[PDB]
């Protein structure tokens, strides 16, 4: 009924698409509900693909990039080494998991080789940025900015413009993406400022930035309203794609309430 | 000269990759590390060889070498034993993978075909690489078995791609039988070749071996097996003529210089004997038995050892003298 109901049967669709996927490689007990719990990777390519009308095409492409999300965390996860998990495993369904995206995506898009432009198009940008990021940490707002906005905005972008090319029309490509690049900042923001008490991690980059006084309580307020009132800005593009509009003033006033406070 | 082409295109592909390698925050560490994947860079040229436009070729080669080498920096990435940077291995590894497809895609016969082949098996090499790094193989039908997804079938998908980024005139599954075969002759040789690097101890066909738990005999036979199937693929029409002594050279390097540091005393197992009749009896001789051999026309005449002092006698035709006699002769 509602879209709440959507989102969170597209989730777990995409949730078992990816499990069922992580199982029939050889992934283990562990390395399956490590997939299954990447809560937000898994919600995310429902967003991206609100435009879509077709529901059956939308939950087919909604799933591949679940598939690819879930397998650059895997990834992310292989460089880092921390999460206790088996690095073959994680290495294979890793491998596994982008073969499978890469195959259904280009099933579904008008011109298959749009994906392979797309996910070349900024490669440099991406793995190049992701490596300068984890080697030096940024000292205030702006090199924050600039770092996440690879390992989020590059990144989350990317899907926009593969979920814009296998979905056909009533999608605005550039917009699409404006909105997934906004929105990804934003869930970055969070994630950096929410610790979840894991093995020598410690405390988010800006988090700490935030308690050093290094970076202040109204720009990062600033930032965020940037991000949201672009955010909006995207899916009110036509032929916009209205049902975005709680869900970035969702996630927007959750870090603003919920999360700003721990660290003001 | 094809031993030129041969050489110009590993180090085309080798300034592919370093190229990207470095373009993408690789460190000078890691641009050396894939510098030196010496095979890895050439082998993109043999599955060209039925390439027939020189433009063509020299692309679908460099592209292939991106995704192998790509493929091999995954791998050393979850094993954690280079010593490299985590990070950078993790995200050039991404970085050549993303190039690759580009580029493959840019060249192949059809829009799905790339991902078609990357995908039709992607749980037969994943689900094996797990496999394989999980238990050790423990006689020759498992090494096959294991050796045969890291490696056959790993190469073999790069194979087929060859073909589908080839132009026109590819017998692809014979690119691929090729490509298949071949990489398990390469795949014994890396077991058996010993690096003495961190941990990189002994090869399991090597251990194997070394416990007897397989035979040498059977080690030969199953590189003559490859052997053949590489050659009978090269000649399918229009068959790939100059892989030939390709197959050759490296099947034989096996048998030459790795198998010996392996078996020993004797590679085949069948002991040499000489059997011959000496006064009414009928007489074999192992040749590690025998002392003093000469010819006398067509005849092969000789001394060996028997109860410990006490000297044997015999002459046989050169027509019956097993190769390892004879070699005595042209050595004595
Ligand atoms: C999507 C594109 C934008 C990228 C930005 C990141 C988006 C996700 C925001 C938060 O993500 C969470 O990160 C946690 C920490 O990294 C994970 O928990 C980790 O730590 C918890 C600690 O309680 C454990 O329970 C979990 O198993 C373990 O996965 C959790 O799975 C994941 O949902
Ligand atoms: C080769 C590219 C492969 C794709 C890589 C991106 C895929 C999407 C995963 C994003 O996951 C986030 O990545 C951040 C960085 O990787 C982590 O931040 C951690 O690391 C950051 C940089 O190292 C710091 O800014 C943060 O404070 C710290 O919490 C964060 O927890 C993690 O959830
Ligand atoms: C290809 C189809 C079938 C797949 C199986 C692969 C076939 C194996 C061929 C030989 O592999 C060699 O193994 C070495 C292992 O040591 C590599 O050096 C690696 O290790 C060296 C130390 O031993 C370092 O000096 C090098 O930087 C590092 O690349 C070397 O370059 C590589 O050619
Ligand atoms: C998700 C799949 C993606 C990666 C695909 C692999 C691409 C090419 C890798 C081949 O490289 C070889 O891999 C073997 C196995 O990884 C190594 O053997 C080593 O490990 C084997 C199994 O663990 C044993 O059989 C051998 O004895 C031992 O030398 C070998 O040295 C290494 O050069």
Same mark, same amino acid.
């Given at each position: 009924?509602?879209?709440?109901?959507?989102? @969170? +049967? +597209?989730? %777990? %669709? $995409?949730?078992?698409?990816?499990?069922?996927?992580?199982?029939?490689?050889?992934?283990?007990?562990? &390395?399956?509900?490590?997939?299954? %719990?990447? *809560?937000?990777? &898994?919600?995310?390519?429902?967003?991206? #693909?609100?435009? #879509?009308?077709?529901?059956?095409?939308?939950?087919?492409?909604?799933?591949?990039?679940?598939?690819?999300?879930?397998?650059?965390?895997?990834?992310?996860?292989?460089?880092?080494?921390? #999460?206790? &998990?088996?690095?073959?495993?994680? +290495?294979?369904?890793?491998?596994?998991?982008? &073969?499978?995206? !890469?195959?259904? !995506?280009?099933?579904?898009?008008?011109?298959?080789? =749009? /994906?392979?432009?797309?996910?070349?198009?900024? +490669?440099?940008?991406?793995?190049?940025?992701?490596? *300068?990021?984890?080697?030096?940490?940024?000292?205030?707002?702006?090199?924050?900015?600039?770092?996440?906005?690879?390992?989020?905005?590059?990144?989350?972008?990317?899907?926009?413009?593969?979920?814009?090319?296998?979905?056909?029309?009533?999608?605005?490509?550039?917009?699409? *993406?404006?909105?997934?690049?906004?929105?990804?900042?934003?869930? #970055?923001?969070?994630?950096?400022?929410?610790?979840?008490?894991? $093995?020598?991690?410690?405390?988010? $980059?800006?988090?700490?930035?935030?308690?050093?006084?290094?970076?202040?309580?109204?720009?990062?307020?600033?930032?965020?309203?940037?991000?949201?009132?672009?955010?909006?800005? %995207? /899916?009110? =593009?036509?032929?916009?794609?209205?049902?975005?509009?709680? /869900?970035?003033?969702?996630?927007?006033?959750?870090? @603003?309430?919920?999360? !700003?406070? *721990?660290?003001?």
């Amino acid at each position: 009924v509602d879209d709440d109901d959507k989102m @969170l +049967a +597209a989730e %777990a %669709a $995409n949730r078992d698409h990816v499990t069922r996927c992580v199982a029939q490689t050889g992934g283990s007990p562990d &390395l399956v509900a490590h997939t299954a %719990a990447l *809560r937000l990777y &898994l919600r995310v390519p429902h967003f991206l #693909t609100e435009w #879509t009308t077709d529901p059956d095409r939308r939950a087919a492409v909604s799933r591949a990039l679940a598939l690819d999300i879930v397998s650059m965390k895997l990834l992310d996860d292989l460089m880092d080494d921390d #999460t206790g &998990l088996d690095r073959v495993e994680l +290495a294979c369904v890793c491998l596994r998991l982008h &073969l499978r995206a !890469l195959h259904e !995506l280009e099933s579904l898009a008008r011109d298959p080789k =749009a /994906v392979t432009d797309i996910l070349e198009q900024d +490669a440099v940008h991406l793995c190049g940025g992701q490596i *300068r990021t984890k080697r030096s940490r940024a000292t205030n707002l702006r090199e924050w900015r600039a770092h996440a906005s690879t390992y989020g905005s590059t990144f989350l972008g990317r899907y926009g413009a593969l979920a814009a090319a296998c979905g056909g029309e009533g999608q605005p490509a550039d917009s699409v *993406r404006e909105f997934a690049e906004a929105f990804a900042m934003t869930i #970055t923001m969070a994630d950096d400022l929410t610790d979840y008490d894991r $093995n020598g991690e410690r405390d988010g $980059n800006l988090a700490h930035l935030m308690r050093t006084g290094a970076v202040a309580g109204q720009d990062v307020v600033d930032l965020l309203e940037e991000l949201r009132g672009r955010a909006l800005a %995207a /899916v009110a =593009a036509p032929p916009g794609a209205p049902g975005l509009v709680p /869900v970035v003033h969702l996630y927007t006033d959750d870090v @603003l309430v919920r999360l !700003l406070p *721990r660290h003001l």
